[PDB]
Amino acid sequence: PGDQRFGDLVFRQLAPNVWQHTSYLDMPGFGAVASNGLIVRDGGRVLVVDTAWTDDQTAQILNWIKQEINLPVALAVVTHAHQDKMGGMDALHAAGIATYANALSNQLAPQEGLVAAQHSLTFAANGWVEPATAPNFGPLKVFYPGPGHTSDNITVGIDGTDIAFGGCLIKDSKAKSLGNLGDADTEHYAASARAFGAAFPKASMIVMSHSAPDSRAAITHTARMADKLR
Ligand SMILES: [Zn+2]
Ligand SMILES: [Zn+2]
Residue 168 Cα to ligand 2 midpoint, Å, equals 5
Give the distance (Å) from ligand 2 centre to CA of residue 208: 9
CA pair distance 75, 77, nearest whole angstrom: 7
Cα of 166 vs centre of ligand 2, distance in Å, is 11
Ligand 1 centre distance from Cα of residue 70 (Å): 30
Total domains present in the chain = 1
With the CA atoms of 187, 188, 191 and 192 taken in that order, what torsion angle do they form, in degrees rounded to the nearest 10?
A: -150
Q: Which ligand is nearest to the CA of 183?
A: 1
Is 229 in contact with 207 (CB distance < 8 Å)? no
> What string of DSSP letters covers 79-111?
-SSSHHHHTTHHHHHHTT-EEEEEHHHHHHTTT
Q: Give residue 150 CA to ligand 1 midpoint distance, Å.
A: 7
Centre of ligand 1 from the C-alpha of residue 98, in Å: 22
Pairing of strands 18-27, 9-15: antiparallel
Burial of 119 (0-12, 13-18, 19+ CB in 10 A): middle
CATH number at residue 39: 3.60.15.10
Contact call for residues 165 and 158 (beta carbons, < 8 A) = yes
CB burial of residue 6 (10 Å; 0-12, 13-18, 19+): middle
**178 CA to middle of ligand 2, Å?**
10
> Strand 31-42 and strand 45-49: pairing?
antiparallel
Task: Name the helix (H) or strand (E) containing 193.
Answer: helix 189-199
Q: Which residues span the domain enclosing 20?
A: 1-230
Method: X-ray
- DSSP for residue 126: T
Torsion, Cα 110 111 114 118, to 10 degrees, reads: -30
Identify whether the C-beta of residue 144 lies closer than 8 Å to the C-beta of residue 123. yes
Nearest to residue 34, comparing CAs of 172, 227, 217, 225? 172
CB 9 within 8 A of CB 52: yes
Q: Which region, left, alpha or beta, applies to residue 141 given φ > 0 means left and ψ of -120 to 50 means alpha?
A: beta
Break the chain down into helix, strand, coil percent, rounded to 5.
25, 30, 45
Resolution, expressed in angstroms to one decimal:
1.1
